[PDB]
Structure formats: C-alpha cells, structure tokens
C-alpha cells in the first residue's frame, strides 16, 4: 500500500479519538442534568407538584393564621415590642406533625423525638422517587446521592436540657446531617448523603452539588431537596425586632407596597440524573437543568445584606456554565423576598444581568413563588424550580400576587413582572435564584425537556398493594379518582406502571377483566372494601417455597386449551413440541384432539385423554415457568407424576410421551372391568369399610384427611355405593371405565413393563416428590418397576403433601385445565394448621388469556414473584400514577 493511504487510516483513528475525548470533556463539565421526578409539600393544602401548580395558577394566597396545636401561646405572643411579634399569619404546614412512622419502619418514640424536617423529607423523597417511574424499593444498593438543604430550626432545643421523652434520639433525630443520612439509610442508597447549611440558599446549592456529583460519575441518580419547619415561633420574634416581616404577612415581591417578608414552611425534593442516563433508561424527563453557579458577595454593606454585583456574577456564571446567551431564557423565578432592602437590589441585578440586549418584544418575565406561599427558607429554590418546571410543562407563566404596581426603586425602563398570567420556535428556558442571607448566592437555569407502541395485551391485571388494608383502600380510592380525571387512558399502560413502577407491599389486591366497564366499579368496591367478581385480595407471604401439582384424571373438559392455542404463542409452541414427541407413539395428532377437529377421538377413550392431559399439563407448567414462576418442587398423582417427571428434568419429553402413551395403551383392555369411587372419609375408616369385599376393592388414592378414592370391580363398586348410601356417606363415582391402582392391573403387568422399556432416567434438577414412596425420590430411580408400582400401588398424596409442607413449601400451583385436587390440598393445609395458599391455572369453560391472567394475579396476590415484564411487556408508555397513600399520625413534642 502507498504511504499516503497508510497514514490516512492513522489520521482517521487519531481524529476519531480526538472527537471522543472532546465529547468526554463536554459531558464531564457541561452535562445537562434531567429532572426525572419531584415532590413537594408547601402551605395551602399543596401535597403534590400538581397541587402546587393548581395553587399558583389559580392565584391562591396560601397564608393563614398561626397553628394552635403546636403549643404556641398565640393569643399572648401578638403585639403590634420586647419579645413579641406583629404578624398573626404566615405559610404553615398544619399537618407537619403528621407522619407515617410505620411505613418507613420508624418508631413513634423515634418519630416524636425526630425533627419534623426529617419526617417531611423522608415522605417527600419517597414520593419523588415514585413520581419518577422508579420503585424506591428497587433503588436499594444503587449509587444514588442525597443532597438536602436543611437547617437546625430547633425542635428538641439542645441548649435547654432536652426533654425526657426525646432522650437518646435528640442527636440522631435532630442533627441536620441525619436529615440527608436517614433517606439513604431507609432507602438503602449508596451515594453520598450530604446536608448543606446555607440559610435561604441551601436547597439550590444542594442541587448544584448533586449536579457536580452526577457529572463526575460519583452518582447514578441524586436527590436534591430542601426542608423548612417551625417548631417554635422564634423566627417571627427575632425578625420582628427589626422591621423585616411585613405587617400583614404578605410578601409583596417587587411591588411598590413592599414592606417586609413573611417566613413559611415547606419541603420540596427532586430526583435527578444525567440526561444521557435518563434517555438510556427510558425515564420521563420533566425538565433539564443545563447549568448552575454559586458564589459569595463578601464585601456587602453588613453581613446580612445583599449585593447586586454578586447576583449579576452568579447569574452570568450560570449562563456561561450552560453555554446559553442571556436572551435565551424568557422567565426568571426571582428570589423576591419582599423586603424593601432586598427587592430593588435583586431587580437591579436581574435587569443588569439578563435584560441588556433582548428583543424589543420579548421582555424577561419575573415572578416569585414567595408571593403565594411566603418565604419557604431553605426549601425556596427547590420549590421555585418546581414552579418553573410546571410552568414549562403547562406552557403558561402564573401571576405573582400582591403587585399593585412595580416598585419605583428600580428603573424598569427589558424586564417585566408577572402581574397576570402570560402564555408561551426554540425550547423554553427559565432561571431560578436562591440568594441567601449568609451571602451565598445561587442560580440555576432549566430548559424544556426534549421531545421523546406495542399491541395491548388483553385482560391486563391492575395491581395494587399497601402496608395495611386501610392504606390499600386509600390507594384504590386515589387511583379511582386519578383515573376519573383522564381522557380514556390505555389499560395496559396502567397495568405496566402499577406492576413495575410500584413496590409490592404486603396487603395486595388485583383487578383482572377484559372489558373497560367493570374496572371502575371494581376499584370502588376495593375502596369501600366490598367484594367484586373481577377483584382478588390477599396477604402475601414473606417466605415460602413454590410447588407445582400434577393431578391425574378428572381435570378434563372439551375445548380446553383451544383459546390458549390461538391467543398464547408460548402455549402453542409447547403443545407443538408435545405433539411432535407424541406422534411416533400414537396414531393421531394432539392439536386435532384439543381443537376438536372432525373425526378426532373424544376424551371418552382412556388412551387419548391421558396423553392429552399430560401434554396440556406440561405446556401449562412450562408457561408458568416462562412467566417467571420457577417451581421449588413438583408433585404428581398417578399419570400426572409422569408429567412431573418431565418438569423435574428426570425424563426427557420423548421418554415421558412414550411412558404415558404406552401405559394408557396397555391400560385399554381394563376398560369396563371396574372403576373408581371418591368418598369423603379418613383412610382408616375407608380401609375398614372395604374389609367385607376383600381383594375386590382397594384404596386407590388417599387425596386428603377426608377424601379417599377406592378402585375395584364394577359389581363390588356398586355394592359399596349402596352401602354408603345406606350409611349416608357422600360417595361419588368418577367417570372412568377402568380400575387403576387395583389388583386388576396385574393382568397387564408385563405390558406395563414394556411401556417404560428403553427410557433413560436422569437425576432431578427440581426436587421431585414421589406419591408412591412418600418422600423425595432420586431422578435415576424412575425405572419400569417404579411406573408399574405407580399404576398399581395406592397413591399417598396426603402423606407426601404433609411432608412437603413440613419442608417449608407454602405455594401450591395446580397446572391443570381445571382444579381437581385443590379441595384435598386445602383440607390438608387446614388440618395441619399451615398458611399455604392453593391456586389453579384454568377452570372448566374458562381457558382463555383472561383466566390465565386471573391465575397469575391470584398467585402474585398470594406473594409469588411473577415476571410481569413477560406478561405485559418490556416497556410501555409511561403513566403518572398517584403516589403512596400514607396513613399518617400526629407526632409532636409536648413541654
């Protein structure tokens, strides 16, 4: 090759690596962070970000009288001088003492001893994770950061000989570091838990630190939040000595009537991560924090004074960090404290920084959340970003209250205030400022999230769960209310969101129906707890090993598996494999028998029903395994054991097909000689009842403590039926013309030995329980003599079920076309006093996808883990479900 073409490839490699390194630099310094979730509790009844949006958009003024349950001497501490205050109303969280101690594992002792800042912050973080489409329980072990802007407002009062009740927990319950630490401890997060003390700027500084941590790869996701609560009214008294609080309590932000600043409570948290990570993981992006900046003023006229130069510098630094021109943003969530000193300085800083070269028809629209709820304090910036996020989402800037006129202290003649709401070529961008009293100015820039199907599975279960039944009812009511205000949501998307993006709690319920006319009433009946046809409820077991159960005959009905053959492709594939295995050892096809094709034999014949039952059971068990329910044990019943022997891995498909087909064919001559009769009695009573007939009859199967099947000759069977009718015993004759598990099979014994010849047994992968021996059996021992004994010796289903329950097994999934042994299994379970729950797959005249999903939902409600991804899908459109319905209780410290 020439030298030129040789060096060309090296140049190409070099420039590609150069581009890769430059892109690495760009994503390592100027990476856009994605706000994937948020959660706020602010005064005025606001509990969700949507509550905040409807509050601020409506122009509601969320300032009301002081709380009366906090022990304050509210009638006495009002004086419009020495140690009193001249304000009688501010933004308060009257439910600040309300907290769900049990949900997070916290004790009432620790809860009352714990700062309400931590109590609010835990719930806010949990809701923020839930609103991001993330399951908080699945966040355990992840490198998730926690950055909280909080402060020691004083709830236990360490300087005052902390009370006897909160003794021992006044460090853990009140250190400001533990406010961030407890989130990670409860949620199991691994990223750093750092709390920031910066007075009225801590939350936005925490967002800055979270952004820097995520950009450096120290975290995968992060919690950037703030909290403010007022255990004592000192913040009003200390700031009343200087005329800093407004006389009426309204934060007249940037208004000519600006005369002070009223404080307020509130918690506000964001769950954020890298934008590329959000796109890769398929999380919904609410907004994009492009850049951030923080600095100081230092040379301010007094320590607690502002500085226009510092505010301009941080604004310009934030703009440069995001790589955005000042004219790019068309809105600012100014601090807007309302002070006479602070407002003109902030307005001058905004005018100098942002509005200097903007077009003559797009002024910068300035507003403040403080006019609505008052000064939140630490949680001010992280609430302002929520306000701007929802303003971008709804495409309208809400009005800022109490602006009778723009303040005359600044020359507006570029920038205009949001006196009334205003509506909105290029992405929407907005700034937020969190200037503090300690001089730490902060500023962030947010941008509109960038613009981002599968067929609907029928009868998609809707899953609900909660820690307690009352919480479950609250969850159902909340979901019903949410679905009422929605124009025709997609039910499969709701099913996916409920199954995947919400924790499975203890008390569970499910709604399985294929029509969008019963789900509403079912949700209601769940809400008031009434029963419903398409509703299932239960208490999931913490631990327990799973069992597959394979009964013998009886679980047959025409058309079984017909609907599943069309609807379910996995079941069709398994039936096809069974048919291919069976073809060589029989003179017809399984699919024709199941589909009821013309001329195919019916289920009356013994030789065709048993292979059909085997194939259906094996296919159903494999479908269960495909849905993620891998058995911990398998048990059978007569011919069903062969199917169990296939699922355990001891017998290949060909060997099991050979055994079942040849065994049934060798059982054909027994037809008409005798039959079975099921009578409900103990084993000893049946045994001593069959004594006069001697060898004619025998105990065919001990299904349960009060359910035994006896097999024998037709004449003796009728004689015993008449005797039971005389004795008033509920004896039922099974529809079978052949007396299996009786002496008659000896007549065909050698032929049975021919049925199992040539097989290749293997050790069991899954522990198989032989109903003949009554305990686990090695897989290699399944020889011809074993199968002959299975056909001949009495089944001991009750004994092996008792032994299996003794081994910690707690779930019994019948893989039949219709439950036949569920009664006996439940009888044994209640006899031994265990908490095991029995389930079935299909039911008579019910074999479509709806019944399959009903069985799966019942199993999940009983506590069996189910891979809902396979049932529903890998990824559907995101759906915003309501957060957890906490059952709160009052927790406050008394003097």
């Amino acid at each position: 090759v020439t030298d030129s073409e040789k060096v060309a490839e090296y140049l190409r490699r070099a420039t590609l690596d150069l581009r890769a390194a430059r892109q690495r630099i760009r994503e390592l310094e100027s990476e856009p962070i994605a706000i994937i979730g948020m959660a706020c509790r602010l005064p005025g009844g606001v509990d969700s970000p949507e509550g905040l949006w409807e509050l601020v958009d409506s122009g509601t003024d969320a300032i009301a009288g002081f709380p009366l349950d906090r022990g304050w001497d509210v009638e006495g501490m009002y004086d419009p001088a020495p140690g009193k205050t001249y304000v009688k109303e501010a933004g308060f969280l009257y439910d600040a003492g309300e907290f769900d101690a049990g949900f997070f594992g916290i004790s009432p002792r620790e809860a009352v001893s714990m700062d309400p800042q931590q109590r609010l912050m835990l719930e806010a973080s949990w809701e923020a994770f839930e609103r991001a489409g993330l399951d908080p329980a699945r966040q355990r072990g992840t490198a998730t950061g926690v950055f909280v802007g909080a402060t020691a407002t004083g709830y236990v009062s360490p300087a005052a000989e902390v009370p006897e009740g909160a003794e021992g927990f006044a460090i853990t319950g009140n250190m400001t570091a533990v406010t961030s630490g407890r989130i990670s401890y409860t949620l199991g997060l691994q990223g750093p838990a750092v709390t920031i003390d910066t007075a009225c700027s801590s939350s936005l500084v925490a967002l800055h630190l979270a952004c820097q941590s995520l950009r450096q790869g120290e975290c995968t996701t992060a919690l950037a939040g703030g909290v403010t609560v007022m255990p004592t009214p000192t913040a009003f008294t200390e700031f009343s000595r200087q005329r800093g609080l407004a006389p009426d309590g309204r934060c007249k932000s940037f208004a000519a009537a600006a005369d002070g600043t009223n404080w307020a409570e509130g918690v506000a948290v964001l769950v954020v991560e890298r934008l590329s990570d959000a796109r890769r993981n398929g999380h919904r992006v609410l907004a994009v924090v492009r850049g951030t900046a923080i600095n100081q003023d230092g040379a301010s006229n007094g320590l607690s004074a502002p500085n226009d130069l510092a505010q301009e510098r941080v604004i310009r630094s934030a703009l440069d960090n995001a790589g955005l021109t000042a004219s790019d943003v068309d809105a600012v969530e100014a601090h807007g404290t309302g002070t006479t000193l602070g407002d003109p300085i902030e307005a001058q800083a905004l005018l100098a920084a942002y509005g200097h070269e903007r077009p003559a028809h797009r002024p910068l629209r300035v507003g403040s959340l403080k006019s609505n709820i008052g000064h939140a304090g630490p949680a001010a910036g992280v609430a302002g970003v929520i306000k701007m996020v929802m303003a971008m989402r709804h495409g309208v800037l809400p009005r800022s209250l109490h602006i009778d006129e723009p303040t005359p202290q600044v020359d507006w003649s570029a920038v205009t205030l949001l006196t009334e709401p205003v509506d909105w070529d290029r992405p929407r961008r907005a700034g937020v400022s969190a200037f503090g009293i300690s001089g730490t100015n902060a500023h962030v820039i947010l941008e509109q999230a960038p613009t981002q199907p599968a067929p609907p599975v029928p009868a998609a279960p809707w899953l609900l769960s909660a820690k307690t039944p009352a919480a479950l009812r609250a969850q159902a009511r909340r979901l019903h209310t949410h679905l009422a205000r929605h124009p025709h949501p997609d039910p499969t998307d709701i099913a996916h969101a409920l199954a995947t993006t919400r924790t499975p709690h203890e008390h569970r319920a499910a709604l399985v129906t294929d029509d969008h006319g019963t789900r509403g009433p079912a949700l209601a009946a769940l809400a008031e707890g009434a029963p419903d046809a398409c509703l299932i409820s239960g208490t999931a077991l913490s631990k327990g090993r799973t069992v597959f159960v394979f009964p013998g005959q009886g679980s047959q009905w025409t058309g079984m598996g017909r609907e599943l053959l069309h609807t379910s492709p996995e079941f069709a594939a398994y039936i096809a494999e069974c048919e291919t295995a069976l073809n060589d050892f029989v003179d017809w096809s399984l699919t024709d028998v199941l589909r009821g094709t013309e001329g195919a034999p019916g289920y009356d014949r013994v030789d065709v029903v048993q292979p059909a039952l085997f194939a259906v059971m094996v296919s159903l068990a494999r479908l269960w395994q495909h849905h993620g329910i891998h058995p911990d044990a398998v048990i059978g019943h007569s011919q069903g054991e062969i199917a169990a022997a296939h699922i355990a891995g001891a017998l290949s498909l060909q060997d099991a097909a050979r055994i079942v087909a040849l065994r049934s064919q060798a059982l054909l001559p027994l037809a008409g000689l005798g039959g079975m009769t099921s009578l409900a009695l103990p084993h000893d009573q049946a045994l001593q009842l069959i004594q006069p007939w001697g060898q004619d009859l025998s105990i065919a199967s001990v299904n349960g403590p009060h359910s035994t099947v006896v097999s024998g000759t037709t004449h003796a069977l009728d004689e015993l039926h008449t005797t039971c009718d005389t004795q008033g015993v509920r004896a039922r004759r099974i529809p079978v013309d052949y007396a299996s598990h009786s002496a008659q099979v000896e007549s065909i014994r050698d032929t049975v030995l021919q049925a199992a010849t040539g097989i290749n047994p293997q050790p069991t992968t899954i522990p198989l329980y032989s109903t003949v021996t009554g305990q686990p059996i090695d897989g290699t021992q399944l020889d011809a003599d074993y199968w002959y004994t299975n056909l001949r010796h009495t089944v001991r289903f009750e004994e092996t079920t008792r032994a299996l329950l003794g081994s910690g097994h707690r779930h019994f999934i019948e893989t039949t076309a219709h439950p036949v042994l569920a009664l006996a299994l439940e009888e044994t379970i209640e006899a031994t006093g265990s908490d095991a729950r029995v389930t079935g797959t299909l039911r008579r005249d019910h074999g479509d996808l709806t019944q399959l999903h009903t069985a799966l939902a019942t199993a999940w409600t009983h506590g069996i883990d189910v891979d809902w991804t396979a049932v529903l899908g890998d990824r559907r459109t995101p759906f915003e479900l309501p957060t957890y319905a906490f059952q709160r209780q009052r927790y406050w410290l008394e003097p």
Partner: antibody
Framework: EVQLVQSGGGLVQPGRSLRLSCTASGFTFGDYAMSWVRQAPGKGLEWVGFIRSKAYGGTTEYAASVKGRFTISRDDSKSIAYLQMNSLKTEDTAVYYC?????????WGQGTLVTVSS | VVMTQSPLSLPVTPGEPASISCRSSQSLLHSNGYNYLDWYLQKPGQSPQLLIYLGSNRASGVPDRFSGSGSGTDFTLKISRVEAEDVGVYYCMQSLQTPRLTFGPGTKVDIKR
C-alpha cells in the same frame, strides 16, 4: 455506534464456492478500506486480503496463499463487504474476521467459523 | 524484510504491573518521525481489538492503564493494573513494510501462580 456483523459460514465440503457477508452500520462505509483476516484453530492471526475505498479506486489485494481463488467485493449502497471463497481447500478451516481499515484494524467483527473438510 | 519478536509467554498477577516488550529487526521509525507499530489484544473467545497505534497513541475506549512506549527497534506495552479481563494474546505488529503476511506468534498472557 460502529457495528460489524458477519454471516455466511456453515459446513462446506472442499472445492466449491462460498460467500461471507459482513454488514457495517455506524460509520461512513465508503471512505474506509476494508479487510478480511483469518485465524486457523490454534494458530495465530493470518491476514487474507483487503479492498481499498471506492474513492481510491476500489482495487483489491490478497495474501500470497489466496491468489485468484479468493475475491473481495463491496456493496457500498447497502454497505456490506463480501468475501467470495472459490475452490475451498481442506486447510482453509478458520474463524474469518471482518475488520475495518486496510492497514490499521481498529474494529473487528465477531468472526465467522468456516470449517471445511470432506 | 522486517521481523518482530516478543517473549513467548509472560505470566502476570492482579496486584503488580507488567510490561510486554518486543523488538523489531529494523528501525521502524519512519521518516515522518512515527514508529509504524501497533499493539492488538485478543481475549479468549472474543475477536481481536486494537490497543495502541503508532507506538504510543492509545485508542479510544481502551483502559488508560495500557500505555505504549519505545522507539526505533525496541518497544514496550506497559500495563499498570493487571486484571483477569486483560488475559489473552498481545500482538505487537508492524506497519512500516506492507503487505503484512501474518501477525506473528504473539505473546500469551496468563495468570501467574
């Protein structure tokens, strides 16, 4: 993101033709010179051949042991490289690797195991 | 004709660095001041991948622990941190003379004990 996916292997008795396709997705296939490099079982890498880019002329060169028998072509419209192996010999059993760059093999395909014997 | 040779094998352990050296039979430093040499890695069961080109320039996506060095005839690939994922065959392969008949015997790298 650059991707090279090979196909067209399978058992072949000696002395017939075979085609190995290798599709490229994630870069400008036209500018790159494209190479095939085989590796017999247990032996080291052994370069087979390459083709220049269409801009350079599209000419082909091959290793000394594969004069005439082997051929290289490229569908630039759909961006696949084709190795036509005519008259396979019993010693051509190897794992043929598909690589970008004539002289510098920056990225390699998964490799197709072509086994030949009577 | 140019000939390149490296040690046949070099046992390594995770816990201490290593250096795979190799020497050419000719001065590979081209007139343009570049040693026309490359270093490739082939892991067991995976296709070969590039590590170094032109003696010292590392390829993007390669771990930073790898570093090529040397000039003229003598070259080395120094690995600061040895990991089980890095076990394989390392080929130092020239490009001054073309066409290249074969990569060469390479240098097997394996866990030392």
């Amino acid at each position: 993101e650059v991707q090279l996916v090979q196909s067209g292997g399978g058992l072949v008795q000696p002395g017939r033709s075979l085609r190995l396709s290798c599709t490229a997705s994630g870069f400008t296939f036209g500018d790159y010179a494209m190479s095939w490099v085989r590796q017999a079982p247990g032996k080291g890498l052994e370069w087979v051949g390459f083709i220049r880019s269409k801009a350079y002329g599209g000419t082909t060169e091959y290793a000394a042991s594969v004069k005439g028998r082997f051929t290289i072509s490229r569908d630039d419209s759909k961006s696949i490289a084709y190795l036509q192996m005519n008259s396979l010999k019993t010693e051509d059993t190897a794992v043929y690797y598909c690589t970008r760059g004539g002289t510098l093999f920056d990225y390699w395909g998964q490799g197709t195991l072509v086994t030949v014997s009577s | 004709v140019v000939m390149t040779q490296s040690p046949l094998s070099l046992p390594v352990t995770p816990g201490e660095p290593a250096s795979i050296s190799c020497r050419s039979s000719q001065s590979l430093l081209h007139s343009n001041g570049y040693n026309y040499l490359d270093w490739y890695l082939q892991k067991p069961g995976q296709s070969p991948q590039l590590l170094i080109y032109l003696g010292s320039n590392r390829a993007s996506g390669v771990p930073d622990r790898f570093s090529g060095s040397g000039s003229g005839t003598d070259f080395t690939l120094k690995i600061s941190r040895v990991e089980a994922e890095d076990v394989g065959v390392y080929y130092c392969m020239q490009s001054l003379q073309t066409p290249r008949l074969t990569f060469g015997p390479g240098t097997k790298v394996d866990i030392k004990r």
